[PDB]
């Protein structure tokens, strides 16, 4: 029935969420960092790379940029999308969790090495896609929202409908806000990189 993708750089509260979803019968898949932490803690999390992804291809830089992962987030409930999900065997991704690493301060002559490869590309694609499709994907970013979502799913037997439309739109607006502030900070670092 269910599937979550955990692609967080800030690991705070990620274990009570992953464990809470696993006890509800959900399938929990994670990117590279979250996976090793959750598996060492003894949770049956799946690797988002091997699963519906593209592992080792470019050091894993496209591992969530596949039809299976991005289609599982963006596909509508139209007859045409349901048919194509069935033809290709693409399950729906019901929950996306995406966090960003801490970025340094904008100082003149900033070396791009201090922030650039920490910039997430596939992550925000999943989170912005989940927020745009919030009726069918739960978009989580702030670790302070994990508990209320997990509790809601726990009252409603783990079904994604247990998170109402009203809560999904609030999380979706928050997701775009976090992404917008993330890009504005990264732009400031590139601008400071161009000074002396």
Which residues fall within 8 angstroms of residue 49, CB to CB, at 6 or more apart?
A: 31, 32, 55, 56, 60, 63
Q: Which of 44, 30, 28 is nearest to 150 (CA)?
A: 28
* H or E stretch covering 87: helix 79-88
Dig out the tokens for 139 from the structure.
């978009």
Where b means 16+ CB within 10 Å and e means fewer, 43-76 reads: bebbbbbebbbbeeeeebeebbbbebbbbbbbbe
**Distance (Å, rounded) from C-alpha 63 to C-alpha 186?**
22
Is 161 buried (19+), middle (13-18) or exposed (0-12) by CB count in 10 A?
exposed
**Distance (Å, rounded) from C-alpha 147 to C-alpha 191?**
37
Q: How many CB atoms lie within 10 A of CB 136?
A: 17
Q: Which of 48, 7, 58 is nearest to 27 (CA)?
A: 48
Between the alpha carbon of residue 79 and those of residues 73, 89, 146, 155, the distances in Å are: 16, 15, 32, 31
**Distance (Å, rounded) from C-alpha 60 to C-alpha 117?**
13
Domains defined for the chain, CATH in brackets: 1-196 (3.40.50.1380)
Dig out the tokens for 150 from the structure.
């997990």
Between the alpha carbon of residue 44 and those of residues 23, 29, 37, 67, 128, the distances in Å are: 10, 9, 11, 24, 27
> Which experimental technique did the depositors report for determining this structure?
X-ray
**Distance (Å, rounded) from C-alpha 16 to C-alpha 112?**
35
Q: Which of 61, 60, 48 is nearest to 6 (CA)?
A: 48
Instruction: Report how far apart the first and last C-alpha atoms of the chain are (Å, whole number).
Output: 55
**Distance (Å, rounded) from C-alpha 114 to C-alpha 102?**
11
Residue count of the chain: 196
- Reported resolution in A? 2.4
């Amino acid at each position: 029935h269910m599937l979550a993708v955990l692609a967080v750089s800030d690991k705070r509260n990620i274990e009570p969420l992953a464990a809470g979803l696993l006890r509800l019968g959900w399938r929990v898949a994670a990117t590279e960092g979250t996976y090793r932490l959750l598996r060492d803690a003894g949770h049956e999390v799946e690797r988002i790379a091997d699963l519906a992804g593209v592992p080792t291809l470019l050091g894993g830089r496209v591992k969530t940029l596949t039809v299976s992962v991005m289609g599982g987030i963006l596909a509508r409930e139209t007859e045409s999308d349901l048919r194509e999900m069935a033809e290709y065997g693409i399950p729906r991704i019901d929950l996306v969790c995406n966090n960003y690493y801490l970025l340094p301060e904008p100082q003149p002559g900033l070396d791009p090495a201090g922030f650039r490869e920490k910039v997430d590309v596939g992550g925000p694609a999943m989170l912005r896609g989940a927020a745009k499709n919030f009726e069918h994907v739960i978009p989580l970013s702030d670790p302070d929202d994990y508990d209320d979502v997990l509790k809601l799913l726990e009252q409603g037997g783990g079904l994604p409908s247990a998170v109402p439309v009203e809560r999904r739109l609030a999380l979706a607006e928050k997701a775009f806000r976090i992404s917008g502030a993330y890009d504005a900070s990264v732009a400031e670092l590139f601008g400071a990189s161009g000074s002396r």
